[PDB]
Amino acid sequence: MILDTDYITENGKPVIRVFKKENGEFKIEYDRTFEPYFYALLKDDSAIEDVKKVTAKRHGTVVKVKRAEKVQKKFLGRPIEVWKLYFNHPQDVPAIRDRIRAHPAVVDIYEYDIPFAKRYLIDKGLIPMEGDEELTMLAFAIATLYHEGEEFGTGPILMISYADGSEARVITWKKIDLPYVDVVSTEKEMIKRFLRVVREKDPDVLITYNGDNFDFAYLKKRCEELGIKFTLGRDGSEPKIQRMGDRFAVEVKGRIHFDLYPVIRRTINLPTYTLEAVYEAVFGKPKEKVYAEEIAQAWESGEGLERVARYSMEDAKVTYELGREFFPMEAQLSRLIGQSLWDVSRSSTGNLVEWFLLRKAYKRNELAPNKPDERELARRRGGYAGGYVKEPERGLWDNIVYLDFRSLYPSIIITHNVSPDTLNREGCKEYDVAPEVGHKFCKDFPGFIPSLLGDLLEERQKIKRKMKATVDPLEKKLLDYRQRLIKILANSFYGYYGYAKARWYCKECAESVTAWGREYIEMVIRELEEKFGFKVLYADTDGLHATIPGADAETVKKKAKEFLKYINPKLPGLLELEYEGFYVRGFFVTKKKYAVIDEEGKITTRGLEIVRRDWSEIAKETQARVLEAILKHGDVEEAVRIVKEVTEKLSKYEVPPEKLVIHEQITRDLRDYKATGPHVAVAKRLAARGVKIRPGTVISYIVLKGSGRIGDRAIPADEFDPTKHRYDAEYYIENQVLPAVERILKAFGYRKEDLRY
DNA sequence: GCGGACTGCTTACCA
DNA sequence: ACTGGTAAGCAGTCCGCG
DNA sequence: AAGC
Ligand SMILES: [Ca+2]
Ligand SMILES: [Ca+2]
């Protein structure tokens, strides 16, 4: 099982290190033979002698082309001849590449920004996280004395919690008498004690919650101020910080630093992402929250020190529990993309697709397009036409069928062979032509992406067969992750085609997919309404809600399945329409906003305030209780009694403040905001007080009684106090509750004023 | 000038 | 930070008005 | 080779 790769320099020459776990033991394999390289397209081959003589400087050392061999490759289908240029050190490439491109004889250069360690994984054909190797994991958390205003690192680390399968303990330097607490001389020895526990436990995986930004940064600054060599690595190295956009990332050599925060942020949609919120969402069990202001007063007084210690251990225990939960699916993602778990767990879809495609490109001798420069990036600014959204037939309807396509965009990319290397190919025998955009795609030979997509559909069939024919419940779950992750990778290719920063960016490809999508959904709707007996109530990109008005449940279902048996044969390749479910009643409010109830009484909510975090619980809860009244029962009169009851409760200040919190994200650097609404106003006040507001930060706030701009009375939910502050009853009635319930009751001819009081 | 309509900046949903 | 399509809140600006 |  390969964990990761990296390189070191021995007498100015690079040596690859492969970190693996074989037969229960950890091993480092060294490779001295691998050479860095990039490609150069020349005007004529005679010029190679001039290009070989091109030089540069790196740390006051003369850098030259080590040697050059002429190679035959494919570039977007067509065969191309380029010169592979080898160099002594990977650092030679960034030093010299600009000058080799500048040279008049050189048309272009390619594959010059591929990190050396990852180049090795791809070219040697190595896949990390192969086999079934039982990896040992240690979770850890820290507790700190904070004070409002101080620089990050001033406050000493009070406690270091850690957890595995066997135990969950706390290291501290205060007199706290508990079984799991370990008291020691000073902060210095506490940190040294933790370093000894990891040396003695020798974990393959370190698990933190937001350790990329908080935990490891704090330990680096405290180790500097105390003069400790923080050697957590298996080669004896210290943890290395790395930049990754708006955020940083901590690497620990030989171990896998598994930070759950980026994982959770990409995997679960929650109103907030506190360790307490994520625990409740994943496992269902509650978790107590001890604040810094409470924690500090408990450290100085020493009265509440025992309570803070329980919080410290619970963070470690829960973090390990979450670690164990997410690691296996992430280790499958590592296998599928063919990069380290460390990289894959911190990567967005763009980089995952790009890494997958780079690997496949090497296998198929495909030269990789360059990442766009500032000027090319500017040319990709323009958008293109998307999905078709039918204006719904608003109101309450009975006996509804939901019909949708299966993997519509992947179906299209495969069926119509949509690829940059098939776009406007010269002298193709056969073509598929995009309906409105009018792009010709060659059918003579399979396209790169289409072919990979074919591979993934068949690979998924194989996995689904293996799952039925396997007794072991563990291997069943592992194969279930693999096929679920394949399905996601497949549904990512459309978006990547339209992603300006993509190497294999193709607007014409993206445009053609959406255009075909619109042709098919609109054709299905037209057929369903003209030929068959159906009224199409609503239709989004790849799915429609239909009924036959003068008909009953058994009829609507029978006629629907008949329509599938009709249409599917008429749809080309793997374009299939499917019966997804029947609904007794459906309530269509606007585009993207509706609710349906099935035969079993389960209500499915789409797009309404109920699902959105930037609405208060009181509004969402009240909208849900008004939907239930109308969808499940028949009583519009019951809904009117609920809205009137909630408005009365708000007026008498009886609704608890937990139900008034509004959650809005900060999406950019605070300076980049042109408009300044409540969450931004609240965020700027926290920033002025010296709180770290990164993009991704969720602002939780409450509106206090007063007039004028909402932002002026917006306060962090944390700092609300019933004794001093009074929440804005009129705001929560007129701006939160009544608007949410009026979406629904608007259709039944209720005025907003009539629902009040 | 008033007070309500309109619009650009946001966000978080949908697919 | 994989795409476009969309409703809607907030806070400024615009615009009817008799 | 790191942080920035
Ligand atoms: Ca549905
Ligand atoms: Ca078919």
mmCIF file with all atom_site columns, C-alpha atoms in Angstrom, chain A residues 486-620:
data_model
loop_
_atom_site.group_PDB
_atom_site.id
_atom_site.type_symbol
_atom_site.label_atom_id
_atom_site.label_alt_id
_atom_site.label_comp_id
_atom_site.label_asym_id
_atom_site.label_entity_id
_atom_site.label_seq_id
_atom_site.pdbx_PDB_ins_code
_atom_site.Cartn_x
_atom_site.Cartn_y
_atom_site.Cartn_z
_atom_site.occupancy
_atom_site.B_iso_or_equiv
_atom_site.pdbx_formal_charge
_atom_site.auth_seq_id
_atom_site.auth_comp_id
_atom_site.auth_asym_id
_atom_site.auth_atom_id
_atom_site.pdbx_PDB_model_num
ATOM 1   C CA . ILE A 1 486 ? -17.065 6.479  -10.078 1.00 0.00 ? 486 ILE A CA 1
ATOM 2   C CA . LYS A 1 487 ? -20.674 7.788  -10.564 1.00 0.00 ? 487 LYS A CA 1
ATOM 3   C CA . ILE A 1 488 ? -19.617 11.251 -9.184  1.00 0.00 ? 488 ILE A CA 1
ATOM 4   C CA . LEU A 1 489 ? -16.358 11.384 -11.286 1.00 0.00 ? 489 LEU A CA 1
ATOM 5   C CA . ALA A 1 490 ? -18.505 10.585 -14.390 1.00 0.00 ? 490 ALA A CA 1
ATOM 6   C CA . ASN A 1 491 ? -21.007 13.438 -13.568 1.00 0.00 ? 491 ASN A CA 1
ATOM 7   C CA . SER A 1 492 ? -18.020 15.885 -13.156 1.00 0.00 ? 492 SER A CA 1
ATOM 8   C CA . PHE A 1 493 ? -16.812 15.793 -16.838 1.00 0.00 ? 493 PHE A CA 1
ATOM 9   C CA . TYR A 1 494 ? -19.601 18.175 -18.112 1.00 0.00 ? 494 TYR A CA 1
ATOM 10  C CA . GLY A 1 495 ? -18.724 20.894 -15.529 1.00 0.00 ? 495 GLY A CA 1
ATOM 11  C CA . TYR A 1 496 ? -14.948 20.459 -16.131 1.00 0.00 ? 496 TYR A CA 1
ATOM 12  C CA . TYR A 1 497 ? -15.491 21.048 -19.919 1.00 0.00 ? 497 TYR A CA 1
ATOM 13  C CA . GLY A 1 498 ? -16.945 24.497 -18.946 1.00 0.00 ? 498 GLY A CA 1
ATOM 14  C CA . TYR A 1 499 ? -14.292 25.287 -16.248 1.00 0.00 ? 499 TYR A CA 1
ATOM 15  C CA . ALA A 1 500 ? -12.109 28.195 -17.544 1.00 0.00 ? 500 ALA A CA 1
ATOM 16  C CA . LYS A 1 501 ? -8.987  26.971 -15.592 1.00 0.00 ? 501 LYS A CA 1
ATOM 17  C CA . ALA A 1 502 ? -9.306  23.378 -17.042 1.00 0.00 ? 502 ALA A CA 1
ATOM 18  C CA . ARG A 1 503 ? -6.516  21.983 -19.303 1.00 0.00 ? 503 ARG A CA 1
ATOM 19  C CA . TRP A 1 504 ? -9.172  20.102 -21.404 1.00 0.00 ? 504 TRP A CA 1
ATOM 20  C CA . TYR A 1 505 ? -11.585 23.120 -21.233 1.00 0.00 ? 505 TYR A CA 1
ATOM 21  C CA . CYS A 1 506 ? -13.954 23.067 -24.284 1.00 0.00 ? 506 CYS A CA 1
ATOM 22  C CA . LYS A 1 507 ? -16.811 25.654 -24.332 1.00 0.00 ? 507 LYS A CA 1
ATOM 23  C CA . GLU A 1 508 ? -18.073 24.081 -27.635 1.00 0.00 ? 508 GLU A CA 1
ATOM 24  C CA . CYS A 1 509 ? -18.252 20.642 -25.843 1.00 0.00 ? 509 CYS A CA 1
ATOM 25  C CA . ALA A 1 510 ? -20.080 22.130 -22.763 1.00 0.00 ? 510 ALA A CA 1
ATOM 26  C CA . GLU A 1 511 ? -22.485 24.169 -25.025 1.00 0.00 ? 511 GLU A CA 1
ATOM 27  C CA . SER A 1 512 ? -23.255 21.039 -27.142 1.00 0.00 ? 512 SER A CA 1
ATOM 28  C CA . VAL A 1 513 ? -24.065 18.887 -24.031 1.00 0.00 ? 513 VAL A CA 1
ATOM 29  C CA . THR A 1 514 ? -26.583 21.446 -22.560 1.00 0.00 ? 514 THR A CA 1
ATOM 30  C CA . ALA A 1 515 ? -28.068 22.016 -26.088 1.00 0.00 ? 515 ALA A CA 1
ATOM 31  C CA . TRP A 1 516 ? -28.653 18.232 -26.582 1.00 0.00 ? 516 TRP A CA 1
ATOM 32  C CA . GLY A 1 517 ? -30.041 18.162 -22.990 1.00 0.00 ? 517 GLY A CA 1
ATOM 33  C CA . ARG A 1 518 ? -32.581 20.902 -23.909 1.00 0.00 ? 518 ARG A CA 1
ATOM 34  C CA . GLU A 1 519 ? -33.481 19.097 -27.213 1.00 0.00 ? 519 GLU A CA 1
ATOM 35  C CA . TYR A 1 520 ? -34.257 15.819 -25.310 1.00 0.00 ? 520 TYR A CA 1
ATOM 36  C CA . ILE A 1 521 ? -36.155 17.228 -22.247 1.00 0.00 ? 521 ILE A CA 1
ATOM 37  C CA . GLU A 1 522 ? -38.260 19.525 -24.548 1.00 0.00 ? 522 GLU A CA 1
ATOM 38  C CA . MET A 1 523 ? -38.891 16.654 -27.057 1.00 0.00 ? 523 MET A CA 1
ATOM 39  C CA . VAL A 1 524 ? -40.074 14.372 -24.138 1.00 0.00 ? 524 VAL A CA 1
ATOM 40  C CA . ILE A 1 525 ? -42.445 17.155 -22.811 1.00 0.00 ? 525 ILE A CA 1
ATOM 41  C CA . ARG A 1 526 ? -43.843 17.845 -26.347 1.00 0.00 ? 526 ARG A CA 1
ATOM 42  C CA . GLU A 1 527 ? -44.454 14.058 -26.933 1.00 0.00 ? 527 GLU A CA 1
ATOM 43  C CA . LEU A 1 528 ? -45.997 13.624 -23.408 1.00 0.00 ? 528 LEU A CA 1
ATOM 44  C CA . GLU A 1 529 ? -48.547 16.513 -23.941 1.00 0.00 ? 529 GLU A CA 1
ATOM 45  C CA . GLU A 1 530 ? -49.496 16.257 -27.689 1.00 0.00 ? 530 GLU A CA 1
ATOM 46  C CA . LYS A 1 531 ? -49.437 12.437 -28.358 1.00 0.00 ? 531 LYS A CA 1
ATOM 47  C CA . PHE A 1 532 ? -50.216 11.092 -24.806 1.00 0.00 ? 532 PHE A CA 1
ATOM 48  C CA . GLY A 1 533 ? -52.789 12.446 -22.290 1.00 0.00 ? 533 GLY A CA 1
ATOM 49  C CA . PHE A 1 534 ? -50.358 14.284 -19.946 1.00 0.00 ? 534 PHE A CA 1
ATOM 50  C CA . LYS A 1 535 ? -50.151 17.860 -18.554 1.00 0.00 ? 535 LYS A CA 1
ATOM 51  C CA . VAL A 1 536 ? -46.453 18.589 -17.659 1.00 0.00 ? 536 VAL A CA 1
ATOM 52  C CA . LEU A 1 537 ? -46.687 20.490 -14.313 1.00 0.00 ? 537 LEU A CA 1
ATOM 53  C CA . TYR A 1 538 ? -42.922 21.282 -13.947 1.00 0.00 ? 538 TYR A CA 1
ATOM 54  C CA . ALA A 1 539 ? -39.637 20.351 -15.728 1.00 0.00 ? 539 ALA A CA 1
ATOM 55  C CA . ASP A 1 540 ? -36.020 21.134 -14.660 1.00 0.00 ? 540 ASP A CA 1
ATOM 56  C CA . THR A 1 541 ? -32.860 20.169 -16.668 1.00 0.00 ? 541 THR A CA 1
ATOM 57  C CA . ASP A 1 542 ? -33.218 16.331 -16.954 1.00 0.00 ? 542 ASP A CA 1
ATOM 58  C CA . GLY A 1 543 ? -36.604 15.518 -15.298 1.00 0.00 ? 543 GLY A CA 1
ATOM 59  C CA . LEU A 1 544 ? -40.346 16.398 -15.445 1.00 0.00 ? 544 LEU A CA 1
ATOM 60  C CA . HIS A 1 545 ? -43.448 16.215 -13.147 1.00 0.00 ? 545 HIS A CA 1
ATOM 61  C CA . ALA A 1 546 ? -46.601 15.121 -15.107 1.00 0.00 ? 546 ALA A CA 1
ATOM 62  C CA . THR A 1 547 ? -50.246 14.028 -14.494 1.00 0.00 ? 547 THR A CA 1
ATOM 63  C CA . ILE A 1 548 ? -53.374 13.195 -16.590 1.00 0.00 ? 548 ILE A CA 1
ATOM 64  C CA . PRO A 1 549 ? -56.036 15.562 -15.109 1.00 0.00 ? 549 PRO A CA 1
ATOM 65  C CA . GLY A 1 550 ? -59.265 13.451 -15.481 1.00 0.00 ? 550 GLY A CA 1
ATOM 66  C CA . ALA A 1 551 ? -57.471 10.260 -14.236 1.00 0.00 ? 551 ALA A CA 1
ATOM 67  C CA . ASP A 1 552 ? -56.722 8.213  -11.034 1.00 0.00 ? 552 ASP A CA 1
ATOM 68  C CA . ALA A 1 553 ? -53.437 6.869  -9.490  1.00 0.00 ? 553 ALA A CA 1
ATOM 69  C CA . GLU A 1 554 ? -53.456 3.377  -11.163 1.00 0.00 ? 554 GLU A CA 1
ATOM 70  C CA . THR A 1 555 ? -54.131 4.963  -14.637 1.00 0.00 ? 555 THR A CA 1
ATOM 71  C CA . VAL A 1 556 ? -51.374 7.683  -14.376 1.00 0.00 ? 556 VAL A CA 1
ATOM 72  C CA . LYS A 1 557 ? -48.781 4.980  -13.366 1.00 0.00 ? 557 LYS A CA 1
ATOM 73  C CA . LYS A 1 558 ? -49.881 2.509  -16.142 1.00 0.00 ? 558 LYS A CA 1
ATOM 74  C CA . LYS A 1 559 ? -49.845 5.228  -18.917 1.00 0.00 ? 559 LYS A CA 1
ATOM 75  C CA . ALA A 1 560 ? -46.416 6.520  -17.645 1.00 0.00 ? 560 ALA A CA 1
ATOM 76  C CA . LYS A 1 561 ? -44.631 3.089  -17.855 1.00 0.00 ? 561 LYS A CA 1
ATOM 77  C CA . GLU A 1 562 ? -46.283 2.682  -21.333 1.00 0.00 ? 562 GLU A CA 1
ATOM 78  C CA . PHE A 1 563 ? -44.717 6.058  -22.383 1.00 0.00 ? 563 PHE A CA 1
ATOM 79  C CA . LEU A 1 564 ? -41.226 4.801  -21.228 1.00 0.00 ? 564 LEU A CA 1
ATOM 80  C CA . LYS A 1 565 ? -41.697 1.586  -23.351 1.00 0.00 ? 565 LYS A CA 1
ATOM 81  C CA . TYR A 1 566 ? -42.571 3.962  -26.300 1.00 0.00 ? 566 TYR A CA 1
ATOM 82  C CA . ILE A 1 567 ? -39.951 6.781  -25.978 1.00 0.00 ? 567 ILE A CA 1
ATOM 83  C CA . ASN A 1 568 ? -36.792 4.847  -24.837 1.00 0.00 ? 568 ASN A CA 1
ATOM 84  C CA . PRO A 1 569 ? -36.393 2.897  -28.153 1.00 0.00 ? 569 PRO A CA 1
ATOM 85  C CA . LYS A 1 570 ? -36.678 6.299  -30.018 1.00 0.00 ? 570 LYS A CA 1
ATOM 86  C CA . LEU A 1 571 ? -33.833 7.845  -27.839 1.00 0.00 ? 571 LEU A CA 1
ATOM 87  C CA . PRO A 1 572 ? -30.284 7.154  -29.180 1.00 0.00 ? 572 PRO A CA 1
ATOM 88  C CA . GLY A 1 573 ? -27.380 5.277  -27.464 1.00 0.00 ? 573 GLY A CA 1
ATOM 89  C CA . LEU A 1 574 ? -27.636 5.272  -23.626 1.00 0.00 ? 574 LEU A CA 1
ATOM 90  C CA . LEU A 1 575 ? -30.264 8.063  -23.438 1.00 0.00 ? 575 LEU A CA 1
ATOM 91  C CA . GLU A 1 576 ? -32.947 6.348  -21.253 1.00 0.00 ? 576 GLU A CA 1
ATOM 92  C CA . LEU A 1 577 ? -35.952 8.020  -19.489 1.00 0.00 ? 577 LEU A CA 1
ATOM 93  C CA . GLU A 1 578 ? -36.938 6.438  -16.085 1.00 0.00 ? 578 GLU A CA 1
ATOM 94  C CA . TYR A 1 579 ? -39.972 6.242  -13.715 1.00 0.00 ? 579 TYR A CA 1
ATOM 95  C CA . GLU A 1 580 ? -38.485 7.680  -10.445 1.00 0.00 ? 580 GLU A CA 1
ATOM 96  C CA . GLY A 1 581 ? -41.695 7.773  -8.295  1.00 0.00 ? 581 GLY A CA 1
ATOM 97  C CA . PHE A 1 582 ? -45.450 8.538  -7.886  1.00 0.00 ? 582 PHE A CA 1
ATOM 98  C CA . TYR A 1 583 ? -46.820 11.359 -5.608  1.00 0.00 ? 583 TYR A CA 1
ATOM 99  C CA . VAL A 1 584 ? -50.457 11.569 -4.296  1.00 0.00 ? 584 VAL A CA 1
ATOM 100 C CA . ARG A 1 585 ? -50.330 15.428 -4.166  1.00 0.00 ? 585 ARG A CA 1
ATOM 101 C CA . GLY A 1 586 ? -47.779 18.035 -5.389  1.00 0.00 ? 586 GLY A CA 1
ATOM 102 C CA . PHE A 1 587 ? -47.464 21.767 -4.519  1.00 0.00 ? 587 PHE A CA 1
ATOM 103 C CA . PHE A 1 588 ? -45.502 23.820 -7.145  1.00 0.00 ? 588 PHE A CA 1
ATOM 104 C CA . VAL A 1 589 ? -44.681 27.367 -5.828  1.00 0.00 ? 589 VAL A CA 1
ATOM 105 C CA . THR A 1 590 ? -42.120 28.674 -8.427  1.00 0.00 ? 590 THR A CA 1
ATOM 106 C CA . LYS A 1 591 ? -39.070 27.507 -10.465 1.00 0.00 ? 591 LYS A CA 1
ATOM 107 C CA . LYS A 1 592 ? -36.769 25.365 -8.199  1.00 0.00 ? 592 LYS A CA 1
ATOM 108 C CA . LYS A 1 593 ? -39.385 25.634 -5.341  1.00 0.00 ? 593 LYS A CA 1
ATOM 109 C CA . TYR A 1 594 ? -42.004 22.839 -4.799  1.00 0.00 ? 594 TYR A CA 1
ATOM 110 C CA . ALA A 1 595 ? -43.063 19.967 -2.463  1.00 0.00 ? 595 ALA A CA 1
ATOM 111 C CA . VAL A 1 596 ? -44.585 16.468 -3.109  1.00 0.00 ? 596 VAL A CA 1
ATOM 112 C CA . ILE A 1 597 ? -46.025 13.733 -0.770  1.00 0.00 ? 597 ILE A CA 1
ATOM 113 C CA . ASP A 1 598 ? -45.717 9.974  -1.643  1.00 0.00 ? 598 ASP A CA 1
ATOM 114 C CA . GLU A 1 599 ? -48.204 7.096  -0.912  1.00 0.00 ? 599 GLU A CA 1
ATOM 115 C CA . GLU A 1 600 ? -46.343 6.365  2.421   1.00 0.00 ? 600 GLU A CA 1
ATOM 116 C CA . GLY A 1 601 ? -46.906 10.021 3.589   1.00 0.00 ? 601 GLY A CA 1
ATOM 117 C CA . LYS A 1 602 ? -43.228 11.184 3.235   1.00 0.00 ? 602 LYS A CA 1
ATOM 118 C CA . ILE A 1 603 ? -43.033 14.874 2.012   1.00 0.00 ? 603 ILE A CA 1
ATOM 119 C CA . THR A 1 604 ? -40.066 15.785 -0.304  1.00 0.00 ? 604 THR A CA 1
ATOM 120 C CA . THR A 1 605 ? -39.145 19.541 -0.149  1.00 0.00 ? 605 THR A CA 1
ATOM 121 C CA . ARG A 1 606 ? -37.135 21.264 -2.971  1.00 0.00 ? 606 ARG A CA 1
ATOM 122 C CA . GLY A 1 607 ? -35.700 24.836 -2.843  1.00 0.00 ? 607 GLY A CA 1
ATOM 123 C CA . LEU A 1 608 ? -38.239 26.266 -0.304  1.00 0.00 ? 608 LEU A CA 1
ATOM 124 C CA . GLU A 1 609 ? -37.059 28.269 2.795   1.00 0.00 ? 609 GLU A CA 1
ATOM 125 C CA . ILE A 1 610 ? -37.350 24.938 4.785   1.00 0.00 ? 610 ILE A CA 1
ATOM 126 C CA . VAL A 1 611 ? -33.996 23.691 3.256   1.00 0.00 ? 611 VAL A CA 1
ATOM 127 C CA . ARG A 1 612 ? -32.018 27.044 3.355   1.00 0.00 ? 612 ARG A CA 1
ATOM 128 C CA . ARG A 1 613 ? -29.627 27.999 6.242   1.00 0.00 ? 613 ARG A CA 1
ATOM 129 C CA . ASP A 1 614 ? -30.015 31.805 5.632   1.00 0.00 ? 614 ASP A CA 1
ATOM 130 C CA . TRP A 1 615 ? -33.594 31.562 7.088   1.00 0.00 ? 615 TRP A CA 1
ATOM 131 C CA . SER A 1 616 ? -34.359 31.337 10.878  1.00 0.00 ? 616 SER A CA 1
ATOM 132 C CA . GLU A 1 617 ? -35.564 27.952 12.329  1.00 0.00 ? 617 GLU A CA 1
ATOM 133 C CA . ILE A 1 618 ? -38.862 29.688 13.413  1.00 0.00 ? 618 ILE A CA 1
ATOM 134 C CA . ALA A 1 619 ? -39.637 30.520 9.702   1.00 0.00 ? 619 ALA A CA 1
ATOM 135 C CA . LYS A 1 620 ? -38.501 27.085 8.346   1.00 0.00 ? 620 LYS A CA 1
#
